[PDB]
């Protein structure tokens, strides 16, 4: 009922797993207004996440809508490797990585396309992704939001918005919703 633990990989922090997954920062040119989904809001960290969800990310959308068959796994991939997990509360299948063991048991996991750090018990339903979907960059890019009450932004999560990219240090953005 519980998955076999990762055989390898380097355990990382919440901050380091964001920096070690593949992100396409060229999709957010500085001093440009771009359209992207408000992936998630993290008021405690005073940051948000935006996701292009391009036509190039179409296969991730197919997996999200459960329109693609996947091979179920009984063994957890290495720490930092990208696979898929079934969220049956929302009945979606989302890309996920395990970044570290958890001090209270389980694992610290990161949903790379939402920008959400979650707890992973170890008995979840997980799938292997095809190599082309696994290699696609993480859609969620972290942003400091200016001219913005981040607390108010929860109403725009999972919704397309327009943001003006003030700064792009190729890790996180300084952007403003317009």
């Amino acid at each position: 009922r519980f998955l076999l633990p990762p055989k390898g990989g380097t355990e990382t922090t919440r901050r380091d797993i964001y920096n070690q997954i593949l992100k396409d920062m060229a999709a957010f040119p500085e001093n440009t207004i771009v359209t992207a989904v408000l992936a998630s809001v993290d008021v405690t960290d005073n940051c948000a996440y935006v996701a292009k969800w391009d036509e190039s990310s179409d296969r991730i959308k197919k997996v999200l809508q459960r329109q693609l068959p996947l091979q179920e796994l009984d063994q957890l991939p290495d720490y930092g490797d990208i696979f898929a997990v079934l969220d049956s509360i929302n009945n979606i299948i989302t890309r996920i990585t395990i970044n570290s063991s958890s001090a209270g048991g389980g694992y610290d996991a990161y949903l790379i396309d939402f920008g959400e750090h979650i707890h992973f018990d170890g008995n979840e339903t997980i799938f292997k992704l095809p190599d082309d979907i696994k290699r696609l960059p993480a859609q969620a890019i972290r942003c400091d939001l200016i001219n913005c009450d981040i607390a108010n932004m929860h109403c725009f999560v999972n919704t397309y918005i327009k943001i003006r990219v003030h700064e792009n240090n190729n890790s996180t953005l300084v952007a403003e919703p317009v």
Binding site: L64, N90, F114, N158
Partner: peptide, 11 residues
């Protein structure tokens, strides 16, 4: 709906 809303955003 939560994350399910994203489906309606990407359909």
């Amino acid at each position: 709906r939560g994350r399910a809303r994203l489906i309606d955003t990407l359909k």
